[PDB]
Amino acid sequence: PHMLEQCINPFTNLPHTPRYYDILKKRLQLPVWEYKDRFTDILVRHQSFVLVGETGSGKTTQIPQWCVEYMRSLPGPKRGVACTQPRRVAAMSVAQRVADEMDVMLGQEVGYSIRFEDCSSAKTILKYMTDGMLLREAMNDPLLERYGVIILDEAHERTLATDILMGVLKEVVRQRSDLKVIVMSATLDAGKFQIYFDNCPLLTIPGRTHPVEIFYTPEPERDYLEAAIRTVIQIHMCEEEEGDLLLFLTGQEEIDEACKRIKREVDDLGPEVGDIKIIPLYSTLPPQQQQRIFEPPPPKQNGAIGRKVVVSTNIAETSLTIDGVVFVIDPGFAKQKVYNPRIRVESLLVTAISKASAQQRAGRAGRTRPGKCFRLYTEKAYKTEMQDNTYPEILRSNLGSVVLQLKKLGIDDLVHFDFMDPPAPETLMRALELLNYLAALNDDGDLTELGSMMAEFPLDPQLAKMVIASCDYNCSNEVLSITAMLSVPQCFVRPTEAKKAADEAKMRFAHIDGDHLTLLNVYHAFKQNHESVQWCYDNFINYRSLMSADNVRQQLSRIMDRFNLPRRSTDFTSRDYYINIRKALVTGYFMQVAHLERTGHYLTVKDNQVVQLHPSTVLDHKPEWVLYNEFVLTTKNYIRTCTDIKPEWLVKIAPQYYDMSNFPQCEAKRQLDRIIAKLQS
């Protein structure tokens, strides 16, 4: 309860650094610090509680440090604090920050954990991790005994992993009385979290948002990116007051294009236009790039106001604060990964945000000073076109990987699992059906040994199955490489002004049988040219994607070693090299197959989606049967990352799915019948 605290670093037993004390002066002014004793009084009297405070309150940086101090007061062998973040960038950035705040090296006493990015050690006693990574730790530690406190942060974003974690933790605290669970959220959400944890205590930090004037367009915009760029430059030139800009866009490629176009239109006035520092923010940035959002704006010679423009996804909506932002530009859209269980189609979608999200975005303009938020739509569109709240992710997502993790966790009854917002029965059906087809569950719905081992891979079940099954095709070395390339962003750089040159460089790698093997060609060439930045530029290859694929492949191969899964290749001189790899792809992606119809479009098997090959495909012809990685749902339906396959592989490898007693009538079925009757003739 009261521990001796000399003025030394308790991890080094040496004085704190000058910087430690400079930082300490500032964080004592954070809104949360007022409440430290009230927080402590709750923590030592209750097993779970809810903490609510606006973004900028100090929740993610300060509360976990208070929990560390609490842990140091307890007897026995030292346990840690976990703090989950929905967002990779928030976890990595804030762990660097808090390591500074605690006067320790990142990865020592303070660390982070993302899929394929573990920055922690035996000394780690505070770990920021994605919520998905904590659920993965529970698979080999069901009561999470490495932690004495677990903080589920950003709970209002209601991600799939956070929702599952809430139900897992609700069960863990029934079995463990020493564990403290803290839910933190930006919004009260009608006391939903408190009720869910059996009417636990609530601590609410008052907000400190300055006034924010909102501006609406007079009429709908025909191009929201054009309106976004137009608004940014007008703010930069027409606002008298100092202050930085925060523009919400929807993803990495859209953000880069905006960053290029802003820099050109601005650089199109040599003199007396203030310097602007243009900073992208999206989910895959390396730590060095993440941290640029925090560095100071340019200086003001003839009085031209200098400013930062952060061009960001909804990472910046609640998960962090960029001090100094005064102007927000809100196109009103975000990107969601949506699953339609009726046709078994998952796809990346750009969609209109909720009123709730719009209010948060505008709130970020008011943290430092009175601000302004430019909503690129009409007020009636706000009132009649935007829903009050974002749907929780659990209600619009593919549950295949979540069902697999729950079954691995030993949670067999998924109908009565205590979801805060239970998913639709049909969606749970498609997840069970998927895992059964992949032989991860048997016909009784029980986890099989293959299922159990698939669950250890931090991959879509389709990919995990493919990786495991490829061992029997003596090509796991290459399917590992392909899997790593599929696990990272697009590797082909294609500038707007150099499409022909980028496309000609891409075709240097093109495999005649399609896109999956082209990715293998890129990765092999990257490795044999010794990870060269120059070689990447010479070939319009994305250096960051390939470095990330190499890391993923390394981490995946340790999982293979741990399960004694052999890492094999076939003789490159034999025809079977590329045939074995193409067959292995079928072991995971037999449900993502399309058949070339007589008039030249494709039809997906069973679900009968009219699609065409995505224009970025290397295929210079239309194979009768293609396996595809991604369904792309724009104005047309495209299937992206496409490989030529033979239909007899479908019936031999995945006959449970290619079951002709339920397969609908179509040209594809006619061919499969012919194949099947020939096998029996």
Binding site: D418, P422, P425
Partner: protein
């Protein structure tokens, strides 16, 4: 119906999921945005 068998085998009767059967019965449909048309066009 392999997914509906596994679901009823888990104990599903009908209607919504959850510990009290309170879940939404039908999946929600998300409206996609085409090109870069502003909200409400």
């Amino acid at each position: 119906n392999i997914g509906n068998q596994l679901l009823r085998k888990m104990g599903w009767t009908g209607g919504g999921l959850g510990k009290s059967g309170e879940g939404i019965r039908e999946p929600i449909s998300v409206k996609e945005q085409h090109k870069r048309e502003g909200l409400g066009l």
